[PDB]
Design a protein around this ligand. Structure first.
Ligand SMILES: Nc1nc2c(ncn2[C@H]2C[C@H](O)[C@@H](COP(=O)(O)OP(=O)(O)OP(=O)(O)O)O2)c(=O)[nH]1
Ligand SMILES: Nc1nc2c(ncn2[C@H]2C[C@H](O)[C@@H](COP(=O)(O)OP(=O)(O)OP(=O)(O)O)O2)c(=O)[nH]1
Ligand SMILES: Nc1nc2c(ncn2[C@H]2C[C@H](O)[C@@H](COP(=O)(O)OP(=O)(O)OP(=O)(O)O)O2)c(=O)[nH]1
Ligand SMILES: [Mg+2]
Length: 500
């Protein structure tokens, strides 16, 4: 048999019939519900902690467990990812992965509207999240072996990997459209990041699936490590509570928003390039091989910290990564039509939002905009809501449907052009005015509603602009000319660049 099949008392009987017949030690394993699957992941120190005080019996115990057919690596699971090839995962990670909370990521397109411009970009958050987890694992392993003085444990590594896996837990339908266009527009009062949803959903994941006990049984300390995991995804003398200041570098793996160099970017760069038809100059594996924890000393009292570093000549590599970042952003992410589709889906969602009910915990109904408040409602919120609306028989959604039908028949708002501000920029709060301005700027009646203005924001490491697109809803030729020249005049008026 496998140890997977063994209940805790089966393990206890195995322990007994192998020579450990003392009630207290059996009580340990009965108490912690240590099913068989955990056995090959047990340590001398783990057995010490669990509470066997026999300096010799720990060794005997581990010998007994070693003599079994099945080993540690024999319980790891192998994914075959077209980006990273095959991928080993520690069973705990699988247990996190095999939950509604996480499986839900299979039903959210990574590039959202992108799929409707790049037919290759059919990929969802799920596979990318797996990827990120794996990469996190890779970098932390590499640093662990190159520098054993770092005292980096299995615990730490798994926490980093789980943070990796679960960073994108809280993305809404069509990914960044939802949190970047829909929510800000539907709930202007509330500031919301997909990360907030990520950590909330992680909490909901482990609580729904009761994985805390499992985490404990595989040698994690839920109380500390969950806070560590959360902190890695979210953020904040030493601010963090998850780990001591001495292990600061660990926080630079999963989400390094400081200098924008993390494994999330690596994975989705590679993946998105794989699916788009672009190819990525940035070789992360050679960032990893050239990676070192290093001691940085800057005086502000002198501040000495352990940061992740790359050799001096891996600066040319970083030139690529930031080019690939822009390369992708320029061509694909802020693609004029992809964004148009995101805008139209947003518009549909907005006009669908009042009528669509989505049940959460205890079956309380939530609107599309408020599902973010309850994870068990949010768990049911996916891209599929697109098709639910489109196919709904309710005549209240005529408005929302009609937009979705237009998306289906490629009857999209036509893109008049792009422009740049010569000096200054547009205040985040100034936006709602812009469609009025463009409409009223005359060179046919053209309402403020007929126009959409899309504002786009272009956007250390240690060694050892604004784009404005205008779209018009009215698609007929006369109005098209009128709108075009309206746009040009608006550009001239605000002293903007020559339109595209
Ligand atoms: N279709 C489309 N996708 C976008 C746009 N902006 C960002 N994305 C997608 C492209 C990336 O594959 C994906 C990365 O999101 P992550 O949650 O992994 O990273 P993060 O939260 O730092 O967002 P960011 O790096 O700013 O894109 O977001 C956009 O304007 N249009
Ligand atoms: N028309 C269309 N394009 C798709 C589809 N899937 C991916 N794409 C790509 C091919 C197109 O080059 C790209 C943009 O499509 P559009 O025809 O809507 O571009 P645009 O509105 O500028 O129209 P135009 O090319 O000026 O007639 O989207 C699809 O189902 N229909
Ligand atoms: N490699 C690469 N692919 C692109 C680029 N822009 C779009 N694509 C992809 C997505 C589309 O499915 C296809 C061609 O899209 P285009 O932007 O060239 O034409 P689109 O109809 O979107 O705009 P258009 O009306 O022709 O100005 O190739 C690009 O700049 N580089
Ligand atoms: Mg086209």
């Amino acid at each position: 048999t496998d140890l997977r099949t063994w209940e805790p008392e089966d393990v206890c009987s195995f322990l007994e019939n192998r020579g450990f017949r003392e009630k207290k030690v059996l009580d340990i394993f009965r108490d912690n519900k240590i099913a068989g699957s955990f056995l090959p992941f047990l340590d001398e120190d783990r057995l010490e902690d669990l509470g066997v005080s026999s300096l010799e019996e720990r060794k005997k115990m581990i010998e007994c467990i070693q003599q079994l057919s099945q080993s540690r690596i024999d319980l790891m699971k192998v994914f075959n990812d077209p980006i990273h090839g095959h991928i080993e995962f520690h069973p705990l990670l699988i247990r996190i992965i095999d939950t509604p909370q996480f499986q839900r990521l299979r039903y959210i397109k990574q590039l959202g509207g992108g799929y409707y411009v790049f037919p290759g970009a059919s990929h969802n958050r799920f596979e990318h999240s797996l990827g990120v987890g794996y990469l996190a694992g890779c970098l932390v392993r590499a640093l662990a072996e190159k520098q054993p003085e770092l005292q980096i444990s299995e615990r730490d590594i798994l926490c980093v990997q789980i943070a990796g896996l679960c960073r994108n837990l809280g993305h809404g339908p069509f990914s960044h459209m939802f949190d970047g266009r829909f929510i800000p527009r539907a709930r202007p009062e509330k500031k919301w990041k997909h990360e907030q949803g990520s950590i909330e959903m992680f909490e909901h994941l482990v609580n729904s699936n009761e994985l805390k006990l499992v985490m404990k049984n595989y040698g994690l300390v839920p109380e500390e490590d969950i806070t560590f995991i959360k902190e890695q995804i979210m953020g904040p003398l030493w601010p963090y509570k998850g780990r001591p200041a001495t292990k600061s570098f660990l926080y630079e793996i999963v989400s390094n928003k400081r200098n924008g160099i993390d494994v999330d970017k690596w994975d989705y760069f590679a993946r998105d390039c794989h699916h788009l038809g672009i190819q990525n100059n940035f070789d992360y594996k050679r960032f990893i091989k050239f990676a070192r924890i290093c001691e940085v000393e800057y005086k502000v009292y002198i501040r000495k910290v352990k940061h992740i570093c790359s050799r001096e000549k891996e600066v040319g590599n970083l030139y690529d990564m930031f080019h690939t970042r822009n390369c992708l952003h320029r061509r694909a992410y802020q693609h004029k039509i992809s964004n148009l589709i995101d805008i139209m889906i947003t518009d549909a969602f907005l006009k669908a939002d009042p009528y669509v009910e989505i049940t959460g915990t205890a079956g309380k109904k939530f609107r599309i905009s408020t599902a973010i408040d309850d994870m068990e409602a949010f768990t049911k919120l996916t891209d599929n809501i697109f098709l639910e609306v489109l196919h709904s028989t309710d005549p209240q959604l005529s408005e929302a449907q009609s937009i979705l039908r237009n998306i289906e028949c490629r009857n999209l708002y036509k893109y008049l052009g792009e422009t740049q501000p010569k000096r200054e920029k547009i205040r985040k709060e100034e936006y709602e005015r812009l469609p009025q301005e463009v409409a009223k700027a005359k060179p046919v009646e053209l309402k403020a509603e007929d126009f959409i203005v899309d504002v786009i924001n272009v956007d250390r490491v240690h060694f050892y602009e604004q784009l404005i697109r205008v779209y018009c809803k009215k698609k007929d030729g006369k109005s098209l000319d009128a709108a075009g020249k309206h746009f040009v005049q608006w550009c001239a008026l605000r002293d903007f660049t020559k339109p595209q």
